[PDB]
Structures are given as structure tokens and as C-alpha cells.
């Protein structure tokens, strides 16, 4: 769908609004599990090509047992902090808990799928993925027993290294992640069986649909969990997550630093906007994310965790259209260091052009097609494909939408240099402003002086 | 066993009880494999299986020259280092003239050697894939029988499994620019792990520490490749040496304090930057301000000291009494009356400020606490989720004992309009001189008036 | 590799010269196609032991397919990019309607066409395995005679073999929402990227080095996963470009300098903030404030324009003369007086203060020199190892020149009471108007009394 952006001069920032939210606001957890079979000993005496290929195959099973049992014993700072796992643990600590793990078994017996009531109070889904307890013991045991480990076939052992290669991976990736892995491999869980996870959560139709066409990003949004291997089952708990929020009006800000340009080469004062970032209507409140890559976009929806979220007024994006409203105080920060730098925004780029830095915007058939004067500027990604800043070349975002310049007066020359506040790094449009009121009735304090 | 404390002065957490294993050196090992490089692929006969073996054979005489071409808040005042001095300084001597025949040499007849490099060093070598021995008198005599054409599917399958190992090494390699981390098991398996860990020269309580915790060693642990000369594969394993167990270890949770006042833009913040772990270490504390450096396993708290500072035993005042004349409390100020939460160990720390709504509930209950405008603390207990605005915190199930200590919150200690709030690395007493020489421009200027 | 290292006491920061410099000033992007058949449905019948191990792999080549489709619908003052943007550009292209037939037809004949999109950009493609003709004229028909009792194992092998590549590319896509990097060997082989470099518009020399240092050119590229449709595989694999190649180069390393007083929490301090590399370009500097964001093989150093600022070239004056009056060099200030260490190319900062134990030993010979409180510097030539604290650094291993020159500590330059202490990204002219006009201050006062 259409996307449209604004450019405020004014304040040397740009809003790309008509996205769509899809925000994780919880988890939601499950058990898989996989059979396994205890193998005592493998009493082939004979050894051959095809012996030796079975019997490392089941080293290599024993050993990945082995090895899960020991297994098994601007802004963004102002954020809270959580613990991503914490839901799992949970379960983890009730799936350790006396006869529980066995309560799974028997509902997984003759079944793939089963809603188990924990002994805490909840009702968990739970899934048997692979049975290789079956397997080992009743589709190569027989084969084995029968010729006395001469196994004629060369099938059976490319076929049981392919039961096996499953169990071996998921092993990798918990051993090497101390067991918790992000994103849910393929080997985690296979496509159908998330798909069938995804069709059988307790949320809506529209939920369902919109995390099974966006299969993609729920891997990533989710983690692995090893828990527990004990009575001829290993089971580990997939935290996947719920988007409680969907389709809601959301928009992104992208700012850059916004200079005066005097003649002197070290005497020019900065502003800078620090609440860039996405911002999604939410139950009357705006979510704010300032950390720019905790937000994935496919198409027009956002999908966006709401664990790296603020919970801001509405009155919030009054900040776009006036900075100097009376209310709400918007977050901008103050230097003196005018260094030339340039922004990309959904269908264009910022560019602050300061000093004798060269900047440029250019098409890829036209080449140079507008030379920036000194100041904060914006063009539109049209008859855009390039930008260039100094000796730092930029590629535009090439999706077709429509762009809107709102001209204005630079802030920046608002305020009158050697008055200045500007060491300020997550200060406000009034917090600035009591603080040049500081400064002030100090010059006054200071030639009261001179005075006498 | 684990207790936690609640500040509600100061708005912090310090959650005591835990034990220390601190990385405080590195060891050095040479693990090698003995390869045998193939000459040419002379396989005139065009068949489906002669087509499986050279494709085998090309992917492993591509191996060998693929890995041949590699071979050619806080923290600010963190010092930097090099995480690979060491195994760097060891791959340099291995490349010394005549070196590589020292260690192929020690490692002909057993599996396991120490060698005395030309410097001085001993270093612990393990040949863990003999392919050379497989592939001289298994595989090419078997090839050249027939022209290519292996009767038995199975030489190609076990040929395969046989160069799975190298392969895959190689692989990790190749997209990781010849250092990987955390430790694979294909670098170095959990059998040869143990192995490797029972030889190093270290304490049986170093020992056992680090093969129960197998995998956090494995995370703090380094592969570098150095060199395929004389038909042998060698690359550096580079392993820590925990020196520093079993000490004390604390954790200090830090969340903005600011007042609660009915008027809009009239309220002052105090946050507390000295969040991070705390270990006693030779009688001072061993500080790692950010959370992911650390991982905690059980009551252990593993650590890596390059990303510590070491500071006195002091520190530990400004979890009791910010104010102390001992040490210089560090904090940071703001007038962003932000709301947000912070999750401890034992529960969770609730900055509430504005129209927010903050509330913790329970599952199996629903609400069972609103919070009051300010900065408050519930146990985790009887509560397991906490909700801040729009974000949905689950909070940690570990049972142990809370500590709600009631005291007077810092802030509101301060006059707003005198207040300095724009402080990032300042502390208690820096903030009292500012004040005071704020007060005494107060003072001065108007008794200079006549 | 001839490096050379010079230490500065009057600054406590030291700056190694002679690196080269490699800035990815642009990108290359190829697209990749590889040719598929789609099975209606299998209708082999799963139970032989025969059977079950072609359909089954057959299964996992059809779900890998179907899985695509799915699919396929200092530092803090530095500028955002796009690292994709190029990328992208060139996918959004093929899903035009009928505009992938273009490529198909192109890539009939040969492996390597270049072909003309409908809409604005000229791309190589590249057609790696042709799993259409193995499936339609050579497995197919083997599996359909026999009514899927493969006799034969070793077509089977082959199969896997064959089907192996499009299941990794497949599984790497499917964990990375259709952007990996850095760009795997399945991505693209060293033979395939060997080939790919040399069709690059650049000089000779830049296609040496990237061909030289194959790893790093794979740490840099992406791999952007976009359309599977009308019986053809194709993705869009984004190359860097090095524009600016053998310019010098030169990485300034900087730690806190505080007075070394008597009086226990009265002290000042005082950091250098332009610590990263520098490396000349186009009459400027380009700097990367970020460490990490550099790759250094020997003298090269490989790194990205687009997280760096372009400076003037008399940022080189903060090394020599801290106070020119030419480059405002950035400093932040501090009371935060904490010991710590700083290991350069060639040595080891040392920035040792109250009473803490500073050391540097040697492995053959232990305890060698004893800091005094202060920011000093040794040269990595007969130490080993340096330990501040409770915190062990090991020093660099590389023979290289070096050099301590002395100067008098700036921070001593300055009187307390009047110093301007939580400064985090000022600047030399910053912090002297502040004290001026708190100095002007009391000098009117105390003149009037």
C-alpha cells in the first residue's frame, strides 16, 4: 500500500507514516519433545564397511545423549530491562518437577499433538516431533538381529544417518548456545510443525493468519529452550511470540543534526532531535522504540517487540508538526560539532551539509542533480538513486510514494550563540530553555559586577 | 540460595549470594590434523559413481586449498585489550622455520604431546583427525583399482562421513574470517574437551568447575586458524583459565527515581549508574558494568575481567547509605520523567511516574498490585508478571528470600530550580559542590548589593 | 608490514602509522538464478525402505521450494544508511510482470549473461545448478520406470548431493528473513566469487586485493532472497567495491588522564573522545569512531564508508599540538578517577591512578617495570604482559618501531574549581569559554571585594 512521508524543515526531521503495527506483547510457550530409546550395548561382533557405519552412527546417538545430559544440570538507554526467557524457565522448572515429564509422555503416546494440564495450574500444548525410540528399537534392531549385524542393505545405513542428522544439529545449536538458541531453526521445528503450532494457539483467526504469512519473522521473534532429558524423553520448550497488536496506525521518525552555517569555521551551534525512532498507536498511547533495529518491516507491516518500548502520550506526535507545543516537552539534544553527515529515510534522504563538505544528490542516468547548500535539506527517492556526503557514498531506498517539504525557519537560529547550552545530550525543548534562562541571569549577575 | 535487597531510597537492587568464576588468563593448545594433499584427479572413466567420488574428492582438495588461501549505562571507562594476543603470539612462533617438524613430529606415535617451542613455551597438541592414514591406504588404493569405479556404495558414504569433520571446520572458517566464537563441537569435541581441560595446569576445583560447565566454556573460548604446512593442519584452541573462584558476587539493579509531583514539568530524576556485577577479588571488587558480559549458571556468575574495572570494597556503602563519606556514589540525573521497569533476580524494580499505568499481576489471579506514582518493588513470589505501559515484563520464578527496606526516596532531598539535571557521569558529592557553588553565587551575589 | 607507534604523554594517546587504507566506497550486486522443476505431488506410494528415502528427500526439495514462495512476499554522531538499498533496488525490479522471463531467456545459452531489466539497471546472472534437467530427463524418468523401486542406490546419492546446495541456500535464508551476511559458501563458492570479482568495473589492483583476501569480502556482502517463480530460483548477492585503496591510514588509541594528587577525592580528569582509524581520502579524512567496525589483515584495513565522517585533514594536528588553533580537538572531562589500560598495535596504555597496582611483566622474567600513578605507556618489545588490577591484558606480538615522547600532562595545565567536570563531547575552545566566563566570574567578584 501507499506510503507517505513528511519532511519538516523546521526542525530537519521526516516522518514516514502509513504503516501497519504487529507488536509482540507477550509469549506464548510449548514443549517439544523427542523419544528416545536407551541402547545398553550393540553385541555385533562382526565388523565389515556396513557394521562400522551403524555402529558410529549409534556412537554418535549415544554421544549426543551424553552430551545434553550434562547440558541439562539516539536514546534506547532509558528502556526497561527484562528477561527474554523468563516465561520458559517457568515451564522448564515444572517440566523438573517429580512426574511431570512422564504426564507428557502418556499424552504423546498415541498422538502427535496434546493439551497437558501442568501441576502448577496451566495448560500447555505439547508436541512429539521426532520418535526415534520406535525407530532404534523396532525398525533397526530387527534388521540387525536377524542376520546376526550382517546387514545386508546399504540402505539402512544411509537412511538411519538421515533419522539421526535431526537430532544431531538441534544438539549443535544448544551446545554451542548454552542452550538457548534464537532464531528457532529449521531444525528446532520443521515448517509443518510450526504451521500446525501456529493453526493451534489460543488467538484470533487474524492472529493465526498473519503469523502464518509471516512464518519468517516469528522464527526470529522466538527462542529454544533445552529443559530436561530424563525417562526415555528429551523435551525442550519453543517461546514463541503473540502479537497482541495488529493493524494499528504507525509511523516512522528520522532525524539529523541541524547546524547554523556562519562564516567563522569554529563558531557554528547544533541541534539535534534524540526521539527518532518508530511510533505506534496503541490503546490510546503511543509505543516508542528509540533502538532503530529492534523493528523488522515486511511490506507495510512492522513487526516490533514491545520489550524495547516506552509507553508515550498521544500528544507525543505534536513534536512533528510543533516542536515548541505546550504539551508535551520534545527530546532534542545540543552540540557545537557541525560535522556533515546524511540520513536515508523510507523514500528519501537528509542531508546537513556544513563546512565546505561537498554533498550531492544524483541519478543513476542523469548523474549530479542537486548540489546542497549549506543547511538541512531533504529530497525525494523519485528521480533520486544516489546521495553523496563527503567522501561517503549512499544508496536511496527505491519504493515509490508520496513525499510532502514543509518549508520553515531553521530552530537553530532561534537561539542566540555564546548563550548557548551545548553540552546537552537527552535534554528538552524546555529544559534547554530554563537553562539558557540559567546563563542568562548569570551575564546579568556578571556585568552587575563589571558594573561596580 | 540467593537474597535480594530493595533500596526503596535509592530506587536499587542488590541481590546477594552468589559465587564467582573469573576468567583472569587465557591458555593456549594446538590442535592438529594430518592431511594428505591429492595430487591430480586423473578419472577418465564417466560413470554416476566415478562422478560421487570425484565431486567427494574435489570438496576436500577444495578444502584444503580454500583454508591454504586464509592462511596468507557506564562502560565508557572500560580499558580495551586483545582478546587474541595470546593465541596470535603462539601461531607466530609455529610459523618459525623448522617449527611445524618439532610439533608433527611429537605427535607421529600418540595422540597427545607437549612440545617445547624454539621461545620456551609448552603447549598441549592433539591430533584429533588422522586423514592422511585413511586416505593412503584405504581410499586410493581402492580408487585405483577399477579406474574410479567403486563397486561398494559404501567407501563413497564412509568417505563422506570420514570428511564431514573437515569440511564443516573449514566452513566455520570461512565465513568468520579464521576466528570463531564460541567454540564449536566441531573444533573441539566435549570428549576432547574434558580431556583438554583435565591437562591443563590448573586447580582439580578448576577442573571440575569448568567440565560441569562444559558450555560456558565453550562461550568464552576462541578458534584461530594459523597454518597448513608439511601435510599437516594445525589451528590454535584458545581456552580460559578461571584463577579467581567462589568469591562473593552481587548484583546492583538501577532504575530512575524522580518525584511524583501533580504539577506537569515541575519533577527532578536520580538514577544510580553503578549497575553491574560485583566480585570480591583480592580484596577489592571486580565490576563489570554491562549485563551480557556476564552469564550466570545456577549460583555462578562466569566472567571475563578485560571487561572490568577493580575497585575498593567500599562500593558496596552505596547500596546502604548513597551518602557515605567513604566513597563517592556515582550517579546520573535527568528531568525525563520516563516510566519503566527493571527485572531482578527476585523480582522487579517499578518506575511509575505520569499518567502511566503500572501494575503487576499474577497468572492465575489476574491484578493483584497497583502501583502508586514513584519507585516501588514487589517480590516475585506470589506475582509473575509485571505490565508497565505497553510492555508485558515476565518476571523471574527462583525462590529465595526479599528484603523491602523502607527509607526516605533521595530525590526528594533536592529543591527543584537549583537542581543540576544534566549529569551523566557525576556523583553525590559532585552534585553537592555544584549545588554548593550554585548557592554560593546565591549567597554572594545578593550580599553584594548596596 | 613495517608499523610504526608514537605514544604522546602530554595527551596519553598514541597513534600507529603506516596502515593501508581499503574503504568500500560502493557496491556490485549479481543475481543468482538457480532453474527449478515443480512436482505437482509425488503420487508414489510411502513404504518400502526403498521408497521411503528418495520420497522423503523428494519432500524435502518440494517443502524447501514451497518454504521460499512463502518467503518471498564517540560514534553517536555518525549518519544512517540503507546497506541494502542497492540490493533491494534490483529485486523490486524482477517482480515485475513477465520481467523474469528476460533473464530466463538470457541465461538458455550460457552460465554468464548480462541482461537488460525492463525498468533501469544492467545485472550479471548466473545460473549455478540446473536441478530442471536433472529432475525431468534424468531422475524422473529413472524413479517413474521402476515404480519407485530405485534399484540403483547411487542415483539416489547423487540426488541428495545435487538437492543438498538449494536445501542450504534454503536453510540459511530461512533463519536470516532473506538477508544473510556475512555471505556463506553456499551463497557463493570461492570459484564462483573468484569469477565474480574479475567482472568487476575496477582496476587491476582493486581485483587483486579483494581476491587475495576472499574472506573479508565475504564479511562485507549480503545475500538478498526475493523470487521463485515461473520454474526459476533467483537471488540478488550484493558485492562491496573498494574505491579508495593504499591511501595512509592511522589508528589513534586514547585513555582517561587524571592529576595524580594527595587528596583522595579531589581530582580531575581529562579524555581524548577522537579515539578510531583514520585513513586519508579525497584531500579528507575519513574517520570510524566504531573499533569494531574495521578488519586489519596485516597492513590493510578493511573498512565501511558508510558508518564514517569525513574530516579535514587538520585533525592530524590533535596528535602533535592539542591546542592548535586550527582543529577544535574533542575532549570530554571527567571526576571519575579510575584505573585503567588501553593495548595498542605496539604496546600498552597504562592509565594508573590512586592505589591501585599497575605492572607489566615479561614471561621468561616476570615484574620488569612498576607504574607510577599517571598515564604511561611500554613498548611491546620486551614485555609480555601488562595487569592493572585485577584485569589481565595481553600485549600485541607484532615487531614493529616505537616511540614515548614526552610532554607535560595537559591535565595539569588546568586548575580545579574552575574546571568544567562532566563535559562528555566537548571540546578544547568548549572547555576554555567555560571556565573563562566562570574565571571572568570571580575575578569581578573578588576585585569588587
Given at each position: 500500500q501507499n506510503i507517505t512521508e513528511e519532511f519538516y524543515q523546521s526542525t530537519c526531521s521526516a516522518v514516514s507514516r502509513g504503516y501497519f503495527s504487529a507488536l509482540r506483547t507477550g509469549w506464548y510457550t510449548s514443549v517439544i519433545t523427542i523419544e528416545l530409546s536407551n541402547i545398553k550395548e550393540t553385541k555385533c561382533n562382526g565388523t565389515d564397511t556396513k557394521v562400522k557405519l551403524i555402529k558410529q552412527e549409534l556412537d554418535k546417538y549415544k554421544n549426543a545423549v551424553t552430551e545434553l545430559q550434562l547440558l541439562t544440570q539516539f536514546l534506547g538507554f532509558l528502556l526497561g530491562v527484562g528477561s527474554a526467557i523468563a516465561s520458559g524457565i517457568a515451564v522448564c522448572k515444572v517440566l523438573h518437577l517429580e512426574g511431570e515429564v512422564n504426564k507428557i509422555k502418556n499424552a504423546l503416546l498415541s498422538t502427535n499433538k496434546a493439551v497437558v494440564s501442568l501441576s502448577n495450574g496451566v495448560s500447555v500444548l505439547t508436541f512429539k516431533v521426532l520418535d526415534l525410540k520406535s525407530y532404534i528399537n523396532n525398525q533397526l534392531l530387527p534388521i540387525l538381529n536377524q542376520q546376526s549385524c550382517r546387514i545386508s542393505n546399504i540402505e539402512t545405513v544411509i537412511e538411519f544417518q538421515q533419522k539421526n542428522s535431526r537430532l544431531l544439529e538441534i544438539t549443535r545449536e544448544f551446545s554451542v548456545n548454552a542452550g538457548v538458541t534464537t532464531p528457532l531453526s529449521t531444525y528446532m521445528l520443521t515448517n509443518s510443525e510450526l504451521l500446525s503450532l501456529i493453526n493451534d494457539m489460543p488467538i484470533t483467526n487474524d492472529q493465526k493468519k498473519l503469523m502464518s504469512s509471516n512464518v519468517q519473522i516469528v522464527r526470529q521473534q522466538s527462542y529454544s529452550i533445552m529443559c530436561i532429558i530424563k525417562e526415555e524423553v528429551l523435551a525442550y520448550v519453543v517461546q514463541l511470540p503473540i502479537y497482541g497488536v495488529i493493524d494499528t496506525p504507525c509511523w516512522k521518525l528520522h532525524t539529523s543534526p541541524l547546524c547554523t552555517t556562519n562564516?567563522?569555521?569554529?563558531s557554528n551551534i547544533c541541534l539535534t532531535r534524540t526521539d527518532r525512532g518508530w511510533y505506534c498507536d496503541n490503546a490510546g498511547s503511543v509505543s516508542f522504540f528509540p533502538q532503530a533495529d529492534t523493528c523488522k518491516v515486511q511490506s507495510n507491516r512492522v513487526f516490533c517487540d514491545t520489550m524495547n518500548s516506552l509507553t508515550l502520550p498521544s500528544e507525543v506526535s505534536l513534536c512533528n508538526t510543533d516542536i515548541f507545543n505546550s504539551k508535551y516537552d520534545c527530546k532534542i539534544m545540543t552540540s557545537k560539532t557541525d560535522i556533515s553527515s546524511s540520513v536515508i529515510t523510507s523514500l528519501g534522504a537528509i542531508v546537513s551539509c556544513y563546512g565546505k563538505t561537498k554533498c550531492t544528490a544524483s541519478n543513476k542516468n542523469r548523474g549530479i542533480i542537486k548540489t546542497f547548500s549549506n543547511g538541512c535539506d531533504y529530497v525525494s527517492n523519485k528521480g533520486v538513486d544516489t546521495v553523496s556526503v563527503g567522501n561517503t557514498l549512499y544508496y536511496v531506498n527505491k519504493l515509490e510514494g508520496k513525499n510532502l517539504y514543509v518549508k520553515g525557519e531553521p530552530i537553530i537560529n532561534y537561539y542566540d550563540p555564546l548563550v548557548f547550552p551545548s553540552d546537552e545530550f537527552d535534554a528538552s525543548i524546555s529544559q534547554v530553555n530554563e537553562k539558557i534562562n540559567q546563563s542568562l541571569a548569570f551575564i546579568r549577575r556578571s556585568d552587575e559586577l563589571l558594573s561596580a
Open positions: 562564516i567563522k569555521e569554529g
